[PDB]
Amino acid sequence: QDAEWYWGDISREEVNEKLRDTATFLVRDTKMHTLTLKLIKIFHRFSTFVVELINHYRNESLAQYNPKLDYPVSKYQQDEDNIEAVGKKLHEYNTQFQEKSREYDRLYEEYTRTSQEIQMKRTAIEAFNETIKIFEEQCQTQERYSKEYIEKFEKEIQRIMHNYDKLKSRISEIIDSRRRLEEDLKKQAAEYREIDKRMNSIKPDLIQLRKTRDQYLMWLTQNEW
Amino acid sequence: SYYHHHHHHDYDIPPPRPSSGELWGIHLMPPRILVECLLPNGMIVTLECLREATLITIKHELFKEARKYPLHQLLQDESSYIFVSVTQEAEREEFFDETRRLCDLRLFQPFLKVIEPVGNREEKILNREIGFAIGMPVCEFDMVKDPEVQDFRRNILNVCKEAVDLRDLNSPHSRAMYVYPPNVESSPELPKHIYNKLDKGQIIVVIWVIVSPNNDKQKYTLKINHDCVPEQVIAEAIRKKTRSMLLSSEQLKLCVLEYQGKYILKVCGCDEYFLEKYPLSQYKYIRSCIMLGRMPNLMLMAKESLYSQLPMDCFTMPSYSETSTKSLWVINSALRIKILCATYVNVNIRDIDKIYVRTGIYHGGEPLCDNVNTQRVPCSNPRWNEWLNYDIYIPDLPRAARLCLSICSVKEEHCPLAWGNINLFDYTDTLVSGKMALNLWPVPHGLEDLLNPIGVTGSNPNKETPCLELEFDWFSSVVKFPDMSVIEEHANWSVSREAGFSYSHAGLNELRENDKEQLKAISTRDPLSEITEQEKDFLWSHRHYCVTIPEILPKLLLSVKWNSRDEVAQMYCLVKDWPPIKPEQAMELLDCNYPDPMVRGFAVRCLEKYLTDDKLSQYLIQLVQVLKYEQYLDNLLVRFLLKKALTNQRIGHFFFWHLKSEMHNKTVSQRFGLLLESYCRACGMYLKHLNRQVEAMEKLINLTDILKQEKKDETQKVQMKFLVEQMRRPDFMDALQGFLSPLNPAHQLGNLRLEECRIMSSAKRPLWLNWENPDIMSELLFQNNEIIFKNGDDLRQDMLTLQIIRIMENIWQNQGLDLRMLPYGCLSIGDCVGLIEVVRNSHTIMQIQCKGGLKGALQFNSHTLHQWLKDKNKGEIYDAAIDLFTRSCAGYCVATFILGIGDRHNSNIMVKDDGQLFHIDFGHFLDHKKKERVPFVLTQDFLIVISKGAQECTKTREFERFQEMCYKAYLAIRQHANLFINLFSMMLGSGMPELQSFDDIAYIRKTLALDKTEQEALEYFMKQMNDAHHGGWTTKMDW
């Protein structure tokens, strides 16, 4: 009657947690008061059958009972006679997720730091551009009122022209600043991609190890590691 | 030798937030800096000015240096023009306040430009306050060209207008009421344990007055019945004051009335008043004073003077102010969605073989089979132009229907790479058609799922992200959801239609079975109990019966098939006139599970009709977060929340801080800013109060930043040298001396006391601040206000637990069980930055042990705690102190176990001088450790205290008493468990790694063992407690 995909008194929550990452059939069962696919209560006394019922809908559509009811997925994973050894092997398998997680989550932070850093630079430029534009307006502003008083070529004009020049040589300095930022933001954007790159590479390795490990752990009969 | 002599060659020796700095790059601008101030003339006079200098002083001296320069005649009289420059947010900001210091401008670069004032509405122009307070320029919003945004701002002011009128309708009583809401409890009837503390409804209260030398104060100690209102209390004080040998009783009685109405009661030493006739006991101060065995100190306050403090709000409106071609049920086709082309997706070519987009239709939880477009164009330049076909007739789409999708890469390599969600109807009840550009979000740390339908609906506003391009079928006309009138017809027709069948099928005979009251049994069930399809049909079939059980309404929506438009139409109608339900019941309806507007709307009306301002403050954190799941910007919950915010300053205060804290969160950045814009525009003179708090927090945020990252690897001595030096500087004196503590704006903060200010030992360099209380009765309450400003940790997890703790105390108190727990004050004011209230005369168990430590080299004598505790409390006190200690200890044991918070050790457990025990630094809160367990384990040390320094303390009357409290208290919480699940469930939005899903919340269920009998649960609760403790927990039950 065990039926290999029968979990006895496994909790409500854990079914969802063993049905975690499933594309499937699994069984649970207040005793005074149940197949999960969509939770359906069963009744031995739901809608001419218990064990045979599972085989009855194993290869048959449940459309008969309800319209919405048009993979056993309880393998014990025999795929190693030493409890400690298989345990050591699964713990050594585990010894990787505990490592794999760390690399995954290390990047997740850098992912975020880099991403925040990026917007900071991103907005910084805007800052420059509008600064930049004002200094332009200023140098343009003087020519209207600069040449307009130019009547002499006595002394004054010569001095003012030198003072006015700083402006064109300051604007030079600033453009160089934004520029210098822009080349870092590129260096950042490219950095950023690589993190996502390596996250999607650990991302699913991290999944398979966690599964067989849980499978090896589930496999034995009595959290050391 | 050790490591099998095997080398590791890899090995060698080798949070974020937008700068709060005065300049870009630099945290602390130098005392003297070079300011290039630009003039209208085209002269760049460069200037050196003090870092803390007024714009006045810079303009005043710029003009002095100006004469000495070319074209002096063109520059006009000072007063004519003003200063403007680019700021750290990339925005040009005109500078109207000339009192503002240079470092307080957050300039991008250290330059200024002079221009004449443009926009005659300088005062209108001066709503930068709003943006300052809000955290982003109001200018940015006007640029936003989305019609929903624009409509939000224009339309939402209805509320603002309405709100303003109520405040000033009954001016000034009414204004003061708004400014200083009465702080009162939920119901007047006092608990019997509270009742016993006073003698046959009698309270001794001290009233203070200042009279004619207006420098001297006079107690009028007196004994009143607790139910007495302040009016009567004011009278009693006037009677006592004016009684005299020359005054006859008639004469005395007449004076009492003339002087009676002229005064109001204010709490001494903090700005809390009593302006509403409630029983004195009902005000919080009063009931605290009772419990703490303290004598109330109210103060007679001249109405005239109090009204003088209030200022005119003077709310002003802002500058900003078809033919329904085909109905949905007309449209006859299956839902179609055309996927075009991803762009920026970045995956290592080698590692992942293929990449595909997966989509599903959703209503919170699915209304048809998810489908995935064929895996294709893996390596790069994905361009699968497939049309996806979803089996659901277009008319059957429910109003709150949303498309959910992600991109995945891959034998089980399944893993999401990006995700996004789209509401299938625009805010105007219109079904969407055409090309759509959707920028996906990155997956959260937690989920292996491929879909993330809880993900906030809408396009990630980060441009430089994977963008997915889409086509929505066009049906020759804009298609709108049907009008309510139209749906009702369909509801009634489908009703009339039911009668005619003969046979019975799985889901619906007329006769209503007494045995099948299973509904009631199911009803009581907690929300996380999965419900079966068989139960679903069962309920659905007896929908009509349930209208008698209003509380079953939420089980009865999860039952509904949202894909069927008939069922939903009928459901809209039940919900229309369904009976009002308890607000805590109603709150479940505003979580991620119930998105339908009709359902939601109903829920708000429960709150509108039945939610007391007291209880709303208690649940205000949850209600702001539920905003994320509301489908559009303009919703009834926001309007409910905004009216309550503008109608009660205390509610508004915390409304603002909770929105502001989340603005860093880019999912809600937009909805919360616009909501802050609304509130700030209309709140009143508070905005100036909030701006002072915001100025202060920014100052502290920048200061701490410098210790945490530039002054690290310095001696505490050097750090405190710096700290003190920096605080004495004038912009700090201005910025922190005079303002309302955000933890509780009743407490006024003035004249920082630097004597008592210091950096704590922690590596995050939390600042410990102490300010003068400027209430004239500083003495009768507290003379010094102390609070801890912490930049580095993420408080909201703590924040939530303290709310949950507070909430357990109330249930227990109101079930007669007197377990006293100190849920100390905590407010998250930004990204991992916060305040924590300071509790005086409270030490960690460890500190106790170190104080009472003998010569050395031994285990500290378990008795030290007891011995320390005995020495503080001597005499008849000692019996009571153990009680308090014992009560608190039992209380925390239950909550801690129920919530499964961080392992407690000597370092995270506090005991007050009086004897009360409290917990701090909860940290992670539902067994996130695993990646059922007793966090709080009473060691020997506690037990000795519990058993008054007995030997072999486990078998004592004292301990027996103790075990009683746990069972009753644990059992008490279990009976209210529904509330806790929703509270948790409502917080799923808030980006908290503990709360990523319903699974997470599910631990509480295990903890309260909602799956067993109450009697079973007590044995199970005893089991774990006996199991963890190693013994003493066994064989007891009810009478």
Author numbering:
A (entry chain B): 329 to 351, 354 to 359, 362 to 365, 369 to 372, 379 to 386, 392 to 393, 397 to 398, 401 to 421, ...
B (entry chain A): -26 to -13, 2 to 308, 321 to 409, 416 to 513, 521 to 943, 950 to 1057
Question: What does the paper behind this entry write?
Answer:
The two recently opened beamlines for macromolecular crystallography at NSLS-II have launched the microcrystallography field into new territory, with flux densities up to two orders of magnitude brighter than those previously available. In this study, we highlight the capabilities of the AMX and FMX beamlines at NSLS-II by describing structure determination from single crystal vector data collection and two methods for multicrystal data collection. The advent of next generation synchrotron beamlines has necessitated the development of new strategies to fully benefit from the increased beam intensity and smaller beam sizes while minimizing radiation damage. The high dose rates, in conjunction with the newly developed ultrafast raster scanning goniometer brings formerly time-consuming serial crystallography measurements into the minutes range. These new opportunities mean that inhomogeneous large crystals can now deliver high quality data collected from their best volume, and crystals as small as 5 to 10 µm can deliver one or more complete datasets.
The PI3K signaling pathway—which regulates cell growth, metabolism, and cell cycle progression—has been the focus of intense interest due to its frequent dysregulation in cancer, diabetes and autoimmune disorders. PI3Kα, one of the four classic Class I isoforms, is activated by growth factor binding to receptor tyrosine kinases, like the insulin receptor, producing the phospholipid, phosphatidylinositol-3,4,5-trisphosphate (PIP3). We have previously published a series of PI3Kα structures, including the holoenzyme, the complex with a lipid substrate analog, and soaked crystal complexes from a fragment-based drug design effort. These structures were determined from crystals grown to an average length of >100 µm, which required an average of 6–8 rounds of macroseeding. Due to advances in synchrotron technology (discussed in more detail below) this present structure could be determined from a crystal of 60 µm, thus reducing the rounds of macroseeding required to obtain diffraction quality crystals. Initial phosphatidylinositol 3-kinase α (PI3Kα) crystals were approximately 5 × 5 × 5 µm, and were grown to an approximate size of 30 × 60 × 15 µm through 5 rounds of macroseeding. A 60 µm vector was defined along the length of the crystal and data collected in 0.2° slices, over a total rotation of 140°, at a flux of 2 × 1012 photons/s, total exposure time 28 s, with a volume distributed dose of 10 MGy (calculated using RADDOSE-3D). The data were processed with XDS, data were cut-off at 〈I/σ(I)〉 of 1.5 with an overall Rmerge of 10.4%, Rpim of 4.6% and CC1/2 of 99.8%, and values in the highest resolution shell of 93.5%, 41.8%, and 68.5%, respectively. Completeness was 96.4% to 3.35 Å resolution. For example, for the PI3Kα crystal, vector collection along a 60 µm vector uses the full volume of the crystal to allow for the collection of better data.
